């Protein structure tokens, strides 16, 4: 019902609000604290008039929080107690977010301690800093405050702030920021235009006092900062009239700040804060977009429309209702600032610190949020406001600039002297703008969005020097790749005739070169060196390295590209060129040739009707793609009755070859037997006939078996299975004793339908999905590697991991579809850790085929019959009401074990990638603990064919009997032979009821044995339970116990030679 859905949305809004708001009792205790702060601040001693340069009157233990780089000034200082104390901010406005509660107090400076010319050469900033220094000294000794600290207000390094927190209990309850402010009408608003000057060049840089030269450059950021203090009380007055009266407007503001918090768009210098949306909602109330009668959800809806549709970098908006002829124009602000907003006083940009890159990225998030808002579906509220979006998980590649001291030289290479003079000495924030624009224009085709990290606001205690710009933090850039345009390895420029070619030569330098093509055009072009798909994915690394060195004098050593470090986990020991996409395509082309060979074969009694592949290789999900092989004659011995080789006793285990299953359906006919075991006979005859014709017409090596035929073509081995359409129906025939024959599902019948019908459909469906998303193969293969490395490969089917990986690309509602393997793997770990498998089935909408009406009906049936379904339920359009891929899937135990491991591995892996230094060991999360297992079995690497696939490379390899030279082979190699898997089958059948075995199929050298606690308890003699159980008489009665000592030597006996040693603990 729509009423139920609306009520659910109302309930979801309310429970979020009560969590994020503050209680009444906390408000009272905060109110008592601020009254105590008011009493303390008003009782402060005064000092006589002193020169600003004279700072010896400061006692030891307190330092000026400004760095005062040009020390010569022209002012005098006097301290007086504050004339007026006013609480400003959002505390009295009723919009405070729970994790961080802050209260702002404005201190009105007396008129008699400030001079008319204090707005020049940072004199006011110096006086304000010394005012806080005197207050910090006198308030430190007071036992009321648990901690007192210095910090930056409004993200400005020239504006220090004072932090006070209470002692003992409630120490995390609230913090108070103390903001000195000038008298209301002290300064002239006309003196603080973006086009006017307030810092003189002779004082800032020159040694001469009146050196003549060019007119003084305007200082818009300096003017904005000075006016920022003068208008502190005005914002609260406007918001009280408009926002305090109407409830629900507060709800929308609170929800929007949570939305900004989740996407990490509020904190840092120049961030889009919750103060800004307070003015944005006021502007919308001024217009007809918002009226005061909506709820909080509608306010969130209305604001998000404005952000996604309005660009503030070209068309600024004004909050000033009055339109005076002698009023500042918006054109001037656009020339001075990247983003233009306005207040009732036109001089206040109010957004002078937010960059164009920041606003574009906020627009990007707003557009994504509107698509979820417009679409009607369940869990949309959870995805919109509760799903975190860190930079590492929202961008395909991240980039680190390790030494920020080099960024100062970038300002020297470029022309930012007026801008460096305007913002004091902050070279980091000055060059952030031009560098992003420089990189954005050079990466236009290969990128969708570029973002930069914001430096955190420092907090340092009294009696320490303030932090420098060099040690502010580390700079990180986020890149959102465009899937189209990554296929090309060239950047196409203009032709050499028209004169904008010279412009192209300027931007790229020596790498710009002349090229001619088949179309007949002479053209300027630049060519990179990228052979594989992975190398083409790292083309922007070459772009950013070349451009930064050429145009910013930033060496390549200062650039750390975090792109595909995980690619080594799905590669060879030393092969970093490709991740395996080229090998998979070659195998697919071989399969297509074989299908065409079947489609045209003559002499068969029944013609071929359908050829379908049912192997992970054909759907690009094989972790290690195969290669064509040529057996060595001397490494084996030969039967000479059949063209089949056998492994030798003295040589090590041969190379592993896995045949790929192909399902073939013949022409329908009515001459087939109606008996279950007789159809098995006809199928076996078809296996023999198919092998005989294939070797006669095309000279292919074929081996016929009762269930399949193995064909060697182009070095690849294919396993061909012939299936009969009505065979599953025959297996369902059950004549009942009363005398009526019916059709009932059977485990054999269900297995046959999965192998011949359901498996080819999923393989073909996932094959098509890879075509739209080239990054699907890397994510899926890496996901299997991590699961199998944690020794939890048993219980997780190959198809189940493919389907959950496909869910990332088909339903990435918070994000965009992944374009790099590393970002998909992080989202895969997040999905496993956070998904509620108990109350939600995973939907994989393969090629649409399901609408919202069918989804809610399936969801309704899911809760009605949850107990009959497995712990993990995956819903596909082909397979609904059941999950055939997880019926034999994970148990309740190992499912929770993976969630714990995934929740543990995610924080350390993201920390490794976000470290400015290189990752210490990318294989840390791929190693198992090896502590909980009762018995550990070690295997000899001589008889492990899949040993190059190990996580830890051994760097030494045995001879496996393969020929390096390509060519044909006249004989069948060894197929599907590995001692580790043969050993596991023997163990899991003899001791399956007693213990559990854990192994890694990719290079595993250890088998973990865990005893079952229930089986080891004494039991009475049951004849069926005497498998390895022995007779005790300690209690005077005959009971059964496992024979631990005899089982251990069975581990050595079974697998003789393969087993190296047996160690048992506890």
């Amino acid at each position: 019902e729509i009423l139920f859905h609306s009520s659910l949305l109302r309930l979801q809004v309310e429970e979020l609000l009560k969590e994020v708001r503050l209680s009444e009792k906390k408000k009272d205790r905060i109110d008592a604290f601020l009254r105590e702060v008011n009493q303390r601040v008003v009782r402060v001693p005064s000092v006589p008039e002193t020169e600003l340069t004279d700072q010896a009157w400061l006692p030891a233990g307190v330092r000026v929080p400004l760095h005062q780089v040009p020390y010569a000034v022209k002012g005098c200082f006097r301290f007086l107690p504050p004339a007026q104390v006013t609480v400003v901010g959002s505390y009295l406005l009723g919009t405070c977010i729970r994790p961080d509660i802050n209260v702002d107090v404005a201190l009105t400076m007396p008129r008699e301690i400030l001079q008319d010319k204090d707005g020049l050469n940072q004199r006011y900033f110096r006086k304000r800093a010394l005012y806080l220094a005197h207050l910090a000294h006198h308030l430190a000794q007071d036992p009321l405050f648990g901690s007192v600290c210095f910090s930056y207000t409004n993200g400005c390094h020239l504006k220090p702030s004072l932090l006070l927190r209470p002692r003992g209990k409630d120490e995390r309850l609230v913090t108070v920021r103390l903001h000195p402010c000038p008298p209301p009408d002290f300064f002239r608003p006309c003196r603080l235009l973006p086009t006017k000057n307030n810092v003189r060049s002779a004082w800032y840089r020159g040694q001469s006092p009146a050196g003549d030269g060019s007119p003084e450059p305007p200082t818009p950021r300096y003017n904005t900062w000075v006016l920022q203090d003068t208008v502190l009380e005005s914002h609260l007055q406007l918001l009280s009239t408009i926002l305090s009266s109407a409830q629900g407007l507060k709800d929308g503001v609170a929800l929007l700040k949570v939305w900004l918090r989740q996407r990490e768009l509020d904190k840092g210098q120049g961030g889009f804060t919750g103060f800004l949306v307070s003015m944005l909602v006021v502007f919308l109330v001024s217009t007809r977009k918002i009226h005061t009668t909506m709820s909080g959800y509608q306010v969130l809806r209305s604001v998000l429309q404005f952000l996604a549709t309005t660009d503030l970098t070209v068309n600024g908006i004004s909050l000033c209702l009055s339109s005076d002829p002698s009023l500042p124009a918006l054109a001037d602000f656009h020339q001075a600032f990247s983003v233009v907003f306005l207040d009732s006083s036109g001089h206040l940009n109010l957004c002078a610190d937010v960059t164009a890159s920041t606003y574009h990225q906020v627009q990007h998030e707003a557009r994504l949020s509107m698509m979820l808002l417009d679409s009607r579906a369940d869990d949309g509220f959870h995805l919109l406001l509760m799903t975190p979006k860190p930079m590492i998980r929202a961008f395909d590649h991240v980039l680190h600039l390790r030494p920020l001291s080099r960024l100062q030289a970038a300002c020297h290479r470029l022309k930012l002297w007026p801008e460096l003079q305007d913002n004091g000495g902050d070279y980091v924030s000055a060059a952030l703008g031009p560098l992003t624009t420089l990189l954005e224009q050079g990466l236009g085709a290969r990128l969708n969005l570029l973002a930069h990290s914001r430096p955190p606001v420092p907090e340092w205690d009294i009696s320490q020097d303030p932090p420098k710009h060099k040690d502010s933090g580390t700079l990180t850039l986020g890149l959102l790749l465009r899937p189209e345009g990554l296929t090309s390895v060239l950047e196409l420029g203009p032709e050499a005739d028209q004169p904008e070619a010279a412009k192209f030569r300027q931007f790229w330098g020596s790498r710009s070169e002349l090229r001619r093509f088949q179309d007949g055009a002479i053209r300027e072009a630049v060519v990179w060196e990228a052979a594989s798909m992975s190398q083409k994915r790292l083309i922007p690394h070459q772009v950013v390295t070349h451009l930064l060195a050429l145009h910013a004098d930033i060496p390549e050593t200062c650039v750390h590209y975090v792109g595909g470090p995980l690619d080594a986990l799905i590669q060879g020991l030393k092969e970093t060129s490709s991740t395996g996409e080229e090998a998979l395509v070659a195998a697919v082309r071989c399969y297509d040739d074989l299908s065409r060979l079947l489609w045209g074969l003559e002499g068969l009694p029944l013609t071929v009707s359908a050829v379908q592949g049912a192997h992970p290789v054909l759907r690009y999900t094989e972790v290690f793609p195969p290669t064509p092989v040529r057996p060595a004659f001397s490494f084996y011995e030969t039967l000479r009755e059949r063209s089949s080789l056998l492994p030798r006793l003295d040589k090590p285990c041969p190379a592993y070859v896995e045949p790929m299953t192909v399902v073939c359906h013949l022409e329908g006919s009515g001459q087939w037997p109606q008996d279950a075991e007789a159809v098995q006979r006809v199928r076996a005859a078809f296996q023999l006939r198919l092998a005989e014709l294939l070797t006669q017409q095309h000279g292919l090596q074929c081996r016929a078996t009762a269930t399949h035929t193995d064909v060697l073509k182009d070095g690849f081995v294919f396993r061909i299975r012939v299936a009969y359409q009505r065979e599953p129906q025959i297996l369902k025939e059950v004549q009942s004793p009363e005398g009526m024959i019916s059709l009932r599902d059977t485990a054999a019948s269900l297995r046959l339908e999965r192998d011949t019908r359901q498996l080819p459909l999923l393989t073909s469906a996932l094959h098509g999905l890879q075509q739209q998303h080239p990054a699907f193969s890397g994510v899926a293969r890496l996901a299997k590697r991590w699961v199998r490395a944690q020794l939890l490969g048993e219980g997780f089917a190959d198809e189940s991991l493919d389907l959950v990986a496909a869910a990332l690309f088909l339903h990435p509602e918070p994000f965009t579809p992944p374009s790099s393997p590393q970002v998909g793997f992080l989202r895969f770990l997040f999905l496993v850790s956070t998904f509620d498998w108990k109350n939600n089935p995973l939907f994989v909408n393969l090629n649409n085929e399901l609408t919202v009406e069918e989804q809610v009906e399936i969801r309704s049936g899911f809760l009605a019959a949850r107990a009959q379904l497995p712990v993990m339920v995956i819903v596909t359009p082909q397979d609904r009401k059941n999950s055939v891929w997880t019926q034999d899937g994970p148990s309740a135990q190992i499912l929770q074990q993976l969630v714990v491991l995934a929740a543990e591995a995610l924080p350390m892996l993201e920390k490794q990638l976000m470290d400015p230094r290189g990752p210490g060991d990318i294989r840390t999360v791929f190693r198992p603990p090896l502590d909980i297992y009762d018995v550990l079995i070690r295997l000899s690497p001589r008889h492990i064919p899949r040993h190059r696939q190990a996580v830890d490379s051994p760097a030494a390899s045995f001879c496996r009997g393969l020929l390096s030279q390509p060519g044909p082979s006249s004989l069948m190699p060894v197929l599907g032979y590995d001692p580790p898997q043969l050993y596991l089958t023997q163990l899991r059948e003899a001791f399956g009821d007693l213990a559990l075995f854990f192994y890694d199929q990719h290079g595993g050298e250890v088998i973990g044995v865990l005893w079952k606690p229930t089986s080891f308890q004494p039991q009475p003699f049951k004849a069926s339970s005497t498998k390895g159980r022995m007779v005790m008489s300690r209690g005077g009665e005959l009971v059964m116990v496992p024979n631990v000592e005899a089982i251990l030597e069975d581990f050595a006996v079974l697998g003789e030679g393969l087993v190296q040693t047996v160690e048992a603990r506890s």
């Binding site: 296929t487 390895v489 002349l514 001619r516 093509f517 002479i522 072009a525």
Partner: peptide, 30 residues
């Protein structure tokens, strides 16, 4: 007797390269 094409997907180069199986030539600047 007849097959008609109604809708085509987005043109992708790699799909065609399976069915059918550049940087350019160098010219010296003056």
């Amino acid at each position: 007797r007849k097959v008609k094409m109604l809708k085509k997907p987005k043109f992708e180069l790699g799909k065609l390269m399976e069915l059918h199986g550049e940087t350019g030539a160098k010219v010296e600047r003056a």
